């Protein structure tokens, strides 16, 4: 399961993120036309990067019951909502009554990952339709 999240980071946050999740050679742009360049994981060039400049960066997070999650939110069957930090989904003591689990994305956004005993990719989300076969009936025509 791969979750893609787009975020907006200032220069300091962008540098920290890029060095934390290794980037070899690529250029990041900002709103005001300012850009920064990483080449072999080194900040070669910056072009007039004022403060309050937001660099938009997409981030890929692998979600798995064994792998711990930074910050997620769980909802039981009755209605109680709770939040957990740094705990794998399988680690929860009470998964019997856990109905939903979202991932809090540091932007206060919410991404569903766990729905009714399964990861969101495994769940199939059945639609609705009345049960019936083909009509296969000849009708009179009005012409």
């Amino acid at each position: 399961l791969i979750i893609k999240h787009q975020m907006k980071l200032h220069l300091n946050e962008l540098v920290d993120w890029a060095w934390r999740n290794g980037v070899t050679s690529e250029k990041f742009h900002s709103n005001n036309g300012s850009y920064v360049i990483f080449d072999h994981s080194a900040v070669v060039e910056t072009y007039i990067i004022n403060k309050n400049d937001l660099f938009n960066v997409t981030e890929e997070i692998e979600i798995t019951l064994d792998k711990p999650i930074d910050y997620f939110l769980e909802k039981d069957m009755y209605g109680n909502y709770r939040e957990h930090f740094g705990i794998a989904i399988n680690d929860l003591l009470f998964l019997n009554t856990t109905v939903n689990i979202w991932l809090v994305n540091d932007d206060n956004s919410h991404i569903l990952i766990y729905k009714d005993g399964k990861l969101i990719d495994e769940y199939m989300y059945h639609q609705f339709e009345y049960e019936a076969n083909q009509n296969k009936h000849i009708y009179p025509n009005n012409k």
């Binding site: 039981d76 009755y78 009470f94 009554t97």
Partner: protein
């Protein structure tokens, strides 16, 4: 004339009242509880007894 005059002779004040109250209180309480216990035990032992007899 008549008896009613005495009421005016000595200042008489008749006071009445009536309070009629109604009150309905409805309370709904719901509660959920979840417990989980996990225990581990382990015990080990050793014994030695030597008996020597003469007859």
């Amino acid at each position: 004339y008549g008896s009613d005059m005495y009421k005016y002779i000595e200042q008489v004040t008749d006071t009445q009242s009536q309070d009629l109250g109604k009150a309905i209180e409805n309370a709904i309480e719901q509660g959920q509880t979840k417990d989980r216990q996990q225990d581990k035990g382990h015990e080990e032992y050793k014994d030695y007894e030597d008996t020597i007899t003469k007859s």
